[PDB]
Amino acid sequence: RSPSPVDPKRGAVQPRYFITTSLTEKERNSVMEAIQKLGQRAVLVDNILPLNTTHIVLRGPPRSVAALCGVVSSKWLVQPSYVFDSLGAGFWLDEEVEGGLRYFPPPLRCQRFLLTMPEGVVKTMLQRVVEFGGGEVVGVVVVSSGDELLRFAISRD
Numbered sequence: 001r002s003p004s005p006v007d008p009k010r011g012a013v014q015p016r017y018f019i020t021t022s023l024t025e026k027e028r029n030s031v032m033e034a035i036q037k038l039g040q041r042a043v044l045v046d047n048i049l050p051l052n053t054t055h056i057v058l059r060g061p062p063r064s065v066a067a068l069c070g071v072v073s074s075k076w077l078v079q080p081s082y083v084f085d086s087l088g089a090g091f092w093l094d095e096e097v098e099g100g101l102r103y104f105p106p107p108l109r110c111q112r113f114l115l116t117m118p119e120g121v122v123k124t125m126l127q128r129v130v131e132f133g134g135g136e137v138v139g140v141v142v143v144s145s146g147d148e149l150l151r152f153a154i155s156r157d
Contacts, residue, residue, distance in 0.1 A: 001098045011092040016042040017052040021066040038087045072133030077101040107156040108133035
């Protein structure tokens with residue numbers, strides 16, 4: 001978060017549809033209350049992503065299925081601090097200056113992926129992430145771990 005302490009850069013005025021992933025109950029409620037308190041066209045949506053999703057709140061790097069789906073569908077991935085800092089500033093801050101992540105255009109789109117791992121929940125989840133991003137799983141990018149898929153996704157264009 002490298003905002004200016006004098007004139008912190010404002011985010012665009014536009015609806016923000018927040019979801020959270022893998023937060024504690026406590027910090028999810030604090031994020032909810034802060035979104036509700038600032039308002040300014042933002043709402044917290046309840047739980048794969050709700051179709052109205054623009055922003056995913058998560059602590060740390062993308063790890064959950066919801067977070068990876070956000071990575072590959074050009075959602076903003078922001079830390080809880082994005083919400084609290086914006087409430088402190090009095091308006092929604094610029095997502096990029098706050099350190100938020102967004103990968104546009106959708107990486108994986110029209111890309112083909114060979115998942116060199118055995119069958120199981122992890123392979124199934126990665127297939128769903130690939131498809132959610134508009135990619136196809138080969139029944140040209142070889143992936144042996146979710147980590148490798150994430151590094152591909154954040155390093156395009």
